[PDB]
mmCIF file of C-alpha atoms and ligand atoms in Angstrom:
data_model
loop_
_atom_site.group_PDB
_atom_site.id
_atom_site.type_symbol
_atom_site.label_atom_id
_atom_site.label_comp_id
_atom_site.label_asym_id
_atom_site.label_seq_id
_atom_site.Cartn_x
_atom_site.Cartn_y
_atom_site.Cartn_z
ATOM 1 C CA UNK Y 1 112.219 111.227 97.608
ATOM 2 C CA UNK Y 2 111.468 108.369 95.301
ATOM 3 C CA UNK Y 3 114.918 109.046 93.841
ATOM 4 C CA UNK Y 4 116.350 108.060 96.746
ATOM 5 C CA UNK Y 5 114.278 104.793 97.781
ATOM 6 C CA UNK Y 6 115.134 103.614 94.248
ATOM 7 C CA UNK Y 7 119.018 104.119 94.490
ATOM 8 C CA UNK Y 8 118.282 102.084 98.335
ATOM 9 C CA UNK Y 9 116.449 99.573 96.652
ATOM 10 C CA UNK Y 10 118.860 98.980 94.065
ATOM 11 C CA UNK Y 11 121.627 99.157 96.590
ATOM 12 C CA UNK Y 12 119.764 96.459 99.215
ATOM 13 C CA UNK Y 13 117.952 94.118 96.705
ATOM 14 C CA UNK Y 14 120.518 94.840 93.243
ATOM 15 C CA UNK Y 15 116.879 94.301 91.720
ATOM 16 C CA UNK Y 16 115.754 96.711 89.353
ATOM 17 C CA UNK Y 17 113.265 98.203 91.773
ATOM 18 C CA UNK Y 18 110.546 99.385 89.205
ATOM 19 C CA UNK Y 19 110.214 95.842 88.191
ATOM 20 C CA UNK Y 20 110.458 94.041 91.217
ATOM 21 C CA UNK Y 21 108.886 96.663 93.342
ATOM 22 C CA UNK Y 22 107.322 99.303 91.370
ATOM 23 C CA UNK Y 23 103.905 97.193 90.943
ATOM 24 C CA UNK Y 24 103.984 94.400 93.183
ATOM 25 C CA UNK Y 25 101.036 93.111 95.532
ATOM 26 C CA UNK Y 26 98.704 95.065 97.011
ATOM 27 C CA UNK Y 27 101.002 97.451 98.878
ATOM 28 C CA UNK Y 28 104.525 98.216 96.336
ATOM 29 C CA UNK Y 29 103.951 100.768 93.700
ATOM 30 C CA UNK Y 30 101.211 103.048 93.316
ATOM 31 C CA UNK Y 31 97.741 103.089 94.593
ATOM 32 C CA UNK Y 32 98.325 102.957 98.073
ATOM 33 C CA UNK Y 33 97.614 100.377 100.789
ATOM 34 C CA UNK Y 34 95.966 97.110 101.330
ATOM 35 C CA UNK Y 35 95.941 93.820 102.666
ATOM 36 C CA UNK Y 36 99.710 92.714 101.875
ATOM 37 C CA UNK Y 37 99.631 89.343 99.788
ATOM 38 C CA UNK Y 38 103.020 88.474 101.398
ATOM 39 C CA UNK Y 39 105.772 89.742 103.648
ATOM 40 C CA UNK Y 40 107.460 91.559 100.644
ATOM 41 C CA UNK Y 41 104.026 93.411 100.078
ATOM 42 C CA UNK Y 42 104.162 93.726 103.737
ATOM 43 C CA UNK Y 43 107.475 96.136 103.335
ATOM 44 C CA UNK Y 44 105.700 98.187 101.165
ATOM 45 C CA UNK Y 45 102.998 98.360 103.714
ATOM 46 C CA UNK Y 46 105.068 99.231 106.309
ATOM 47 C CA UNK Y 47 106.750 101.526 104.080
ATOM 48 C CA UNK Y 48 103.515 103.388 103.303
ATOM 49 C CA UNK Y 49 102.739 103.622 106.403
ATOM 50 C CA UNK Y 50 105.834 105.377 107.620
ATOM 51 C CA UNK Y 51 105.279 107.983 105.391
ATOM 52 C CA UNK Y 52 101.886 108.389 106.351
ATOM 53 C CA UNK Y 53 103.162 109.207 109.694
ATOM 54 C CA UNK Y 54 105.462 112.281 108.305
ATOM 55 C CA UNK Y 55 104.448 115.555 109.465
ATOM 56 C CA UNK Y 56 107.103 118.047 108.624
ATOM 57 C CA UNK Y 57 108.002 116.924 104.973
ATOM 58 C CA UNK Y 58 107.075 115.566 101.992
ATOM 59 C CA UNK Y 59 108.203 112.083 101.113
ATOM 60 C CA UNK Y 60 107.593 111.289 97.960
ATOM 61 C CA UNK Y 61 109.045 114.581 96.611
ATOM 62 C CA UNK Y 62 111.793 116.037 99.261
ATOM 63 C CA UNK Y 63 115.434 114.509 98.175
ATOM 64 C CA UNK Y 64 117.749 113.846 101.236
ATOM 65 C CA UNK Y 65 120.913 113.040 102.215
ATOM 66 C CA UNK Y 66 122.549 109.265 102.949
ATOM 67 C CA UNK Y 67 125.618 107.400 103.128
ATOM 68 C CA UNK Y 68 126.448 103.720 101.865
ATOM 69 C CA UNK Y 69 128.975 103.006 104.897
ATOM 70 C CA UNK Y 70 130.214 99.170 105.072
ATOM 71 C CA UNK Y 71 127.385 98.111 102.617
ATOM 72 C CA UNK Y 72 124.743 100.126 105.149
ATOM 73 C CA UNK Y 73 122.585 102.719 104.374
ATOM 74 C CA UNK Y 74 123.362 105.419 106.814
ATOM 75 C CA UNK Y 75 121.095 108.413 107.173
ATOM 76 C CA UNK Y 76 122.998 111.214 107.797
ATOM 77 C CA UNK Y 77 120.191 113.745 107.541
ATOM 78 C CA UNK Y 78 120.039 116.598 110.523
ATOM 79 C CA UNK Y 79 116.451 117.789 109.116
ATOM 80 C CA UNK Y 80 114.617 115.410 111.229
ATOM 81 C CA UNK Y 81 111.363 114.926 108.779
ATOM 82 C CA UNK Y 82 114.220 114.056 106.177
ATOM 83 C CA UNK Y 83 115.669 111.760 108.385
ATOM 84 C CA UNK Y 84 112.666 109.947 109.560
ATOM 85 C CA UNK Y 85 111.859 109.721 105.751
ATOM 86 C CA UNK Y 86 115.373 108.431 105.240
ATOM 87 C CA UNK Y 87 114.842 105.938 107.897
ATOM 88 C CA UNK Y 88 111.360 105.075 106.513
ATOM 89 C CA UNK Y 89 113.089 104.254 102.863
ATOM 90 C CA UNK Y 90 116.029 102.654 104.455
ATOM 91 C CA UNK Y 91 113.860 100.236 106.243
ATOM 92 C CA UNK Y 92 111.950 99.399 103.443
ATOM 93 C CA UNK Y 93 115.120 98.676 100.901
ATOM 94 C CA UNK Y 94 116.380 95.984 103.737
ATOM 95 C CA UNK Y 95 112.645 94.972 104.162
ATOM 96 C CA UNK Y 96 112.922 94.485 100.535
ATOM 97 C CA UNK Y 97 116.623 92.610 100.458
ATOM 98 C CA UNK Y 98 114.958 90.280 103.891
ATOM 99 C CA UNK Y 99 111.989 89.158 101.969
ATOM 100 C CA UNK Y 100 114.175 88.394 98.515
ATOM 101 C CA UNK Y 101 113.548 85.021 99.963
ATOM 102 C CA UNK Y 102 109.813 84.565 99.768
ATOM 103 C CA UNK Y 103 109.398 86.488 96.636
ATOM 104 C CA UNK Y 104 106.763 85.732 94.243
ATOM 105 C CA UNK Y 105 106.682 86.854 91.098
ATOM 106 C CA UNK Y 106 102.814 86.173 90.559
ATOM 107 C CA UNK Y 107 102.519 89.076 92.590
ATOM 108 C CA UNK Y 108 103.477 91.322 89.996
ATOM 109 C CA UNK Y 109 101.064 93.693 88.399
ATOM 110 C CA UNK Y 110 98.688 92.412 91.282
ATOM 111 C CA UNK Y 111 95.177 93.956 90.574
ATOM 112 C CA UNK Y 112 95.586 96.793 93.443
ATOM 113 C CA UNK Y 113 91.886 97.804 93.069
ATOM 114 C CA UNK Y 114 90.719 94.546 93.996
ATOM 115 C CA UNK Y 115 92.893 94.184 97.341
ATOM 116 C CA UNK Y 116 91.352 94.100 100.726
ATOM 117 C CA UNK Y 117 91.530 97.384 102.536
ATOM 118 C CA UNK Y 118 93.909 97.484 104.293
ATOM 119 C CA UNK Y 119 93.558 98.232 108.272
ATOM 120 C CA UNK Y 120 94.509 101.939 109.031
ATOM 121 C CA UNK Y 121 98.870 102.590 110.014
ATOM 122 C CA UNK R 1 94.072 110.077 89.303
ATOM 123 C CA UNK R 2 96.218 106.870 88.096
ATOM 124 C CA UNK R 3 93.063 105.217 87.813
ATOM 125 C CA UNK R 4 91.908 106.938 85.178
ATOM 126 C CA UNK R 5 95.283 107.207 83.415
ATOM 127 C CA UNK R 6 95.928 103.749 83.721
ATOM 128 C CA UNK R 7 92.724 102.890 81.929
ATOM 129 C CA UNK R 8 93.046 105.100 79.161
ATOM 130 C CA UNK R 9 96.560 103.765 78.049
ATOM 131 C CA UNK R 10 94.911 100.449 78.076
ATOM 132 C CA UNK R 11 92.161 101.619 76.192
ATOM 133 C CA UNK R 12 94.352 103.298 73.414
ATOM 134 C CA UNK R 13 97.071 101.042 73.724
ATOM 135 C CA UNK R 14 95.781 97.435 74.329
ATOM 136 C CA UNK R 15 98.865 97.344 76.737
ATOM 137 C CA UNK R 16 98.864 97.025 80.735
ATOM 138 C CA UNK R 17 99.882 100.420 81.451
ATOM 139 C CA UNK R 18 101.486 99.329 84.678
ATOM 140 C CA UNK R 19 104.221 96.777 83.645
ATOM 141 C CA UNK R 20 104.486 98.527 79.836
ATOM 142 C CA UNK R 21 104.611 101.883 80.854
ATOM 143 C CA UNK R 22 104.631 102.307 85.241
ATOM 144 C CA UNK R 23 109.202 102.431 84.302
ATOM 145 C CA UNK R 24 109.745 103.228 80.966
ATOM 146 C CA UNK R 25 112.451 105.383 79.531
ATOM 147 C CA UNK R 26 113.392 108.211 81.403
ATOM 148 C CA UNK R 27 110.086 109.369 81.590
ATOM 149 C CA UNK R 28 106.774 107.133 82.096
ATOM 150 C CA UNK R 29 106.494 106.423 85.643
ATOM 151 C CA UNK R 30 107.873 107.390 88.922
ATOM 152 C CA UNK R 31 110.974 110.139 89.202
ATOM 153 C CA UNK R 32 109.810 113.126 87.135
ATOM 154 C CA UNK R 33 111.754 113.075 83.488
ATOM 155 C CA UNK R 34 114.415 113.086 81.781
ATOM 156 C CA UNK R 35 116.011 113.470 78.049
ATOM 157 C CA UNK R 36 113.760 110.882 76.322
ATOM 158 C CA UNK R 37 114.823 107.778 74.953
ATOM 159 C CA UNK R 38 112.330 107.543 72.376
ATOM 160 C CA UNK R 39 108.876 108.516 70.724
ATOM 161 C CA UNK R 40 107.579 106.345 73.694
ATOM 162 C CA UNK R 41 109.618 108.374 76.215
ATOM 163 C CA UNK R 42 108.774 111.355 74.625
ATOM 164 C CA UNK R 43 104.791 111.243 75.399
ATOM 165 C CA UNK R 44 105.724 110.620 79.146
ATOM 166 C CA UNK R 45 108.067 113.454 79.039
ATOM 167 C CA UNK R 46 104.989 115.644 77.840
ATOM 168 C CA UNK R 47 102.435 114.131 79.890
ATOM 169 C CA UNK R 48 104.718 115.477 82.596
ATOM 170 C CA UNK R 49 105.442 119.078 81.281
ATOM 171 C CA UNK R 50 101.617 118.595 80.619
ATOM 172 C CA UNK R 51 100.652 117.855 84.947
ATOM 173 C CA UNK R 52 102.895 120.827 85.453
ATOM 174 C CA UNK R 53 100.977 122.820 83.617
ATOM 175 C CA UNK R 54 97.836 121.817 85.883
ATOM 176 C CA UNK R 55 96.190 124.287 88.392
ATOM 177 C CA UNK R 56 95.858 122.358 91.587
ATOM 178 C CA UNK R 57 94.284 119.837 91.564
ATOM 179 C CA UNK R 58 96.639 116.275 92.062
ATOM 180 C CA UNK R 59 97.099 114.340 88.665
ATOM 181 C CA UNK R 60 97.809 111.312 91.223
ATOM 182 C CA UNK R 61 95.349 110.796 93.614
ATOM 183 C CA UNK R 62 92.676 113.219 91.648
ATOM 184 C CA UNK R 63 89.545 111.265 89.837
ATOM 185 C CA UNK R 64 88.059 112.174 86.638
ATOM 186 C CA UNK R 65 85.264 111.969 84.700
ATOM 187 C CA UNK R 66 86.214 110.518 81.527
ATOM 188 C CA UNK R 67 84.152 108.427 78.854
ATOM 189 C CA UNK R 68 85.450 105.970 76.079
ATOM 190 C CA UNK R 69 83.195 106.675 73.504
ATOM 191 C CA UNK R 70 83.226 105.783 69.638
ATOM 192 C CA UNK R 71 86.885 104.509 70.808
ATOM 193 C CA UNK R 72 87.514 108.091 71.660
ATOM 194 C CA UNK R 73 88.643 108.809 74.923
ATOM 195 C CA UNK R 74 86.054 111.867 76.184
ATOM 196 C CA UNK R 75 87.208 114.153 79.046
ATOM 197 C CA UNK R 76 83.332 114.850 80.233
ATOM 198 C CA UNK R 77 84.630 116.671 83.320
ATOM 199 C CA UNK R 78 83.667 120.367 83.745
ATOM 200 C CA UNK R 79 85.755 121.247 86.866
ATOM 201 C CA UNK R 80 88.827 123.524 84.963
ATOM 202 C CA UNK R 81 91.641 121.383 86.186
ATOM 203 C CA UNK R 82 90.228 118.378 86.284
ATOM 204 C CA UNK R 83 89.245 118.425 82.803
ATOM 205 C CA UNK R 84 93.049 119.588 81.263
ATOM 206 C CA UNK R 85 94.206 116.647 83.923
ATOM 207 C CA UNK R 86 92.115 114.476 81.819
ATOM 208 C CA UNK R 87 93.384 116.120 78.847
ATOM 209 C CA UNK R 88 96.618 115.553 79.657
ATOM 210 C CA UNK R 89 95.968 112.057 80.494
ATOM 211 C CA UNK R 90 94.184 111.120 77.115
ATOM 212 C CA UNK R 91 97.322 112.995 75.235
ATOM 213 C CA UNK R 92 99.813 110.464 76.710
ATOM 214 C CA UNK R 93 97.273 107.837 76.573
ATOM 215 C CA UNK R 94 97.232 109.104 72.472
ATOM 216 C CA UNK R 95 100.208 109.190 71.754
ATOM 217 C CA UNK R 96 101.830 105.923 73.877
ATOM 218 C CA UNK R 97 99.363 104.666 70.985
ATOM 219 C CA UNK R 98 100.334 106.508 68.029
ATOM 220 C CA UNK R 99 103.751 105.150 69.036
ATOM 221 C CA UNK R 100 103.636 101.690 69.618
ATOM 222 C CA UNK R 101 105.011 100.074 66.932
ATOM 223 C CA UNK R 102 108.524 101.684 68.373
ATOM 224 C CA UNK R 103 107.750 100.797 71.812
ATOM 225 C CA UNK R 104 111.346 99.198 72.620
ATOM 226 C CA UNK R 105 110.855 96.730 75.800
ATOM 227 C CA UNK R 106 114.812 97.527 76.463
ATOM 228 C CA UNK R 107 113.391 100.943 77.796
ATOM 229 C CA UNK R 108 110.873 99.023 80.594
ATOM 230 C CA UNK R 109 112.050 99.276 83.695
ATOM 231 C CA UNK R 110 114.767 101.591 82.253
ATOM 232 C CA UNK R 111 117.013 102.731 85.413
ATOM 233 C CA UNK R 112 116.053 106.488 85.643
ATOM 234 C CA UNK R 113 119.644 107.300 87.701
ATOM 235 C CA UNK R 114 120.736 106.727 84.115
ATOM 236 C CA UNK R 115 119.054 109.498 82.489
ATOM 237 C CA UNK R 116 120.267 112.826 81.384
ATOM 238 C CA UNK R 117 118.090 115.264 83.205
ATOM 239 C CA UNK R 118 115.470 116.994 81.315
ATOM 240 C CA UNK R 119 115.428 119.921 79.293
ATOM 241 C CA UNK R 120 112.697 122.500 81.243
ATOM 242 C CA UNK R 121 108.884 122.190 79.728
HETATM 243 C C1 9AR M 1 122.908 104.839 90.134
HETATM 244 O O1 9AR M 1 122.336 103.548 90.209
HETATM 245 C C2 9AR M 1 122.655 102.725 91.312
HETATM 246 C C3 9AR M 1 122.765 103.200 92.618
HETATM 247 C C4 9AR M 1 123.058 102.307 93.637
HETATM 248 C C5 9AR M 1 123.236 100.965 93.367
HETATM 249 C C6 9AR M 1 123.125 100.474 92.063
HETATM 250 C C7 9AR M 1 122.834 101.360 91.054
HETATM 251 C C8 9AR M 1 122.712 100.929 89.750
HETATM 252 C C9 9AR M 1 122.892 99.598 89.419
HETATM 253 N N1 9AR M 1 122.701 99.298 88.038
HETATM 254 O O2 9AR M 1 121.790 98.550 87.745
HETATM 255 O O3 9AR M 1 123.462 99.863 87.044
HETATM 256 C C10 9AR M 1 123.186 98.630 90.428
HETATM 257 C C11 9AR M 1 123.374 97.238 90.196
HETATM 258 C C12 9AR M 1 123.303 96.528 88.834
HETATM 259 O O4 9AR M 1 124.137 96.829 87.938
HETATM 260 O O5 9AR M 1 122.440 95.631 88.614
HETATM 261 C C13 9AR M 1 123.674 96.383 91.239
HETATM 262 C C14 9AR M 1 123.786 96.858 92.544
HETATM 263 C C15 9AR M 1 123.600 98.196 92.807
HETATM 264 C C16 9AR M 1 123.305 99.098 91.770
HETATM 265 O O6 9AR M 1 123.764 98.390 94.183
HETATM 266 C C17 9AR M 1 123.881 97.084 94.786
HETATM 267 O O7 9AR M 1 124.066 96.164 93.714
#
């Protein structure tokens, strides 16, 4: 669930991920997808994407289980929808932490509405 | 849909609801509620008892027919659910108004982990 992604997020970046994350180019926060503005939005695009592509489970809403083993999130989840959800928020946390580096703070509160669509995951 | 939500707190408020109110408290935003920090909190917290009320239809992605008229927001829409989404919408959009001049910015982007959990609606 979002619970989880946030605790991730916190754990990869140490940003507060609401503020860094929770509104952020065309692809982080609500709204859904489109064109990413930059390889940070690009996470989130991924990110979206991956839990597009979720069959069995509900990502948003369905907590699961993981492990912070030598400063690595570990997703020990046997349910495998809960795992590849895991593995979806997981990836976007160090997608996050990666792209600290090119992070631009203009692209916070990006006006989603106006992004270009994006192209289908 | 957050659309239409987003709107109407900017209406009412004057604020951007995204970076005033998309992580506020324990309640306004992502991850469901929690005991409320303040007045602030408080409509979030029963904007959210308020969606669980609903009867189907999906306060997130949903779209409304709403008017701002006479500085009034108008929930026009007929369709049962939609219309007491809308309702519920204009309520927080209300009162995030009504309680402004408490608004603490110490709350945005308030780490939800930290929050006692919420009482049931
Ligand atoms: C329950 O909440 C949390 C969980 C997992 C991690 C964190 C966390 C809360 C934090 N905060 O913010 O209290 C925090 C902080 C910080 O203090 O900034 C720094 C970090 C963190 C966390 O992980 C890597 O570096």
């Amino acid at each position: 669930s979002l619970f989880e992604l946030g605790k991730m997020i916190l754990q990869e970046t140490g940003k507060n991920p609401a503020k860094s994350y929770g509104a952020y180019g065309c692809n982080c926060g609500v709204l859904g997808r489109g064109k990413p503005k930059d390889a940070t939005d690009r996470c989130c695009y991924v990110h979206k994407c991956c839990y597009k592509k979720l069959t069995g489970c509900n990502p948003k809403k369905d907590r699961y289980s993981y492990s912070w083993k030598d400063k690595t999130i570990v997703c020990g989840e046997n349910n495998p929808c809960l795992k590849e959800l895991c593995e979806c928020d997981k990836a976007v946390a160090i997608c996050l932490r990666e792209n600290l580096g090119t992070y631009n703070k203009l692209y916070r509160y990006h006006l989603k509405p106006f992004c270009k669509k994006a192209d289908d995951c």
